């Protein structure tokens, strides 16, 4: 049995201001009696109502996920949330913890461009984004179609990896409809990050 406890997305924390964190338990045999998944906060204030979900899997494996809303002011102020999985089977209990990752912080730089139009792309054009030199690693990448935010499905972005010096970096590749670059020939790559200033947002525009 394995257990994972996520952080708020920067977007959920600094734009929507409705952050949540999810505690995910995996590798359960449905045979066993159900698992206890309780919460604790470092502050000792009580825990909001958490949402439980069970979903059996193609592995014969069973997934129980619990999502808890968290206070924005509470999280940034340096709060600690902790999830605890217990079972009548398991000997002791699993505990996973989350916090604002303290350390030095740098806001991200952003650049967007086009990949060279290439054979096999008559109606398809490809747009790219480079986001680098930020820390900590928590970042939210956004493509917007001229004052309209695009579905996150339309773009696929790489996992943050460490630079030679000290910053992080990610890549966002995006293919835009012929209609889309014709309806509006401007596309925006925006990053949300706690160092970014102001409103924790930096963005650029690039066209076909």
């Amino acid at each position: 049995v394995s257990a994972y406890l996520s952080r708020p997305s920067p977007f959920d924390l600094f734009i929507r201001k409705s952050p949540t964190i999810t505690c995910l338990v995996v590798d359960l045999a449905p045979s066993k009696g159900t698992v206890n998944l309780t919460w604790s906060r470092a502050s000792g204030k009580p825990v909001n109502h958490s949402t439980r979900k069970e979903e059996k899997q193609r592995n014969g494996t069973l997934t129980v996920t619990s999502t808890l809303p968290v206070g924005t002011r509470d999280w940034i102020e340096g709060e600690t949330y902790q999830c605890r999985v217990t079972h009548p089977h398991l000997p002791r209990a699993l505990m996973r913890s989350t916090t604002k990752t303290s350390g030095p912080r740098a806001a991200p730089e952003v650049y967007a461009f086009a990949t060279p139009e290439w054979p096999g792309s008559r109606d398809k054009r490809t747009l790219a984004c480079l986001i680098q030199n930020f820390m900590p690693e928590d970042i939210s990448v956004q493509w917007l179609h001229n004052e309209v935010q695009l579905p996150d499905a339309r773009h696929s972005t790489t996992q943050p990896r460490k630079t030679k010096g000290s910053g992080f970096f990610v890549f966002s590749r995006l293919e835009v409809t012929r209609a889309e670059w014709e309806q509006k020939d401007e596309f925006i790559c925006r990053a949300v990050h706690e160092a970014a200033s102001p409103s924790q947002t930096v963005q650029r525009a690039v066209s076909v």
Partner: antibody
Amino acid sequence: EVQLVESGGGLVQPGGSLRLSCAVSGYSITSGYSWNWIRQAPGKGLEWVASITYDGSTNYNPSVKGRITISRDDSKNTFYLQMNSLRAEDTAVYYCARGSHYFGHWHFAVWGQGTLVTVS
Amino acid sequence: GSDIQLTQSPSSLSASVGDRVTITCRASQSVDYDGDSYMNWYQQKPGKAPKLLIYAASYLESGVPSRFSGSGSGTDFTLTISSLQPEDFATYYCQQSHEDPYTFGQGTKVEIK
């Protein structure tokens, strides 16, 4: 970032009383967490003395209940240790600390530099 | 005297940089409850206030060097410094948070040789 300062220590005569203050900055002591007093006799072990929660609950160490009081002052973001009838065994360094909460139990994650109390 | 008394060993020890140091805490009665053990480990360098290292027997406080590790259950707990370091020479305390009043062990001084 949650810094704690003891004050009000000093040399005091036996049978008298004194009051120590913990001047908390960077967090509202009514906003969350547990606020404690721990003292340490010169070259002796740590003894936990008293606690007060963000919601006003008190707890005392029975070895000093009845002659020790813990109180708080929201506006000055300060909390206090009231001690009457000082003895020699009260001679120690008094630390205040912010305890963090784990499924109904507290650990002492943030401390202050300490203030010394000397009797006789 | 119905409190939980924590006895540590050794009281004092000498080591060299790179050694493995192992410190032990023995409680008068079980500090187990609900699948966890409420034993915390602190480091105190001289003339400075303690620092929290491990809570709940085995969880490392944030920003704590990875070489520190805790283990144990029941009335037997262990702090392990896997590779001693020049700054780690200090007195080390265990404290139980299971039953009031909270109690501390008597401390173990790890001295540089």
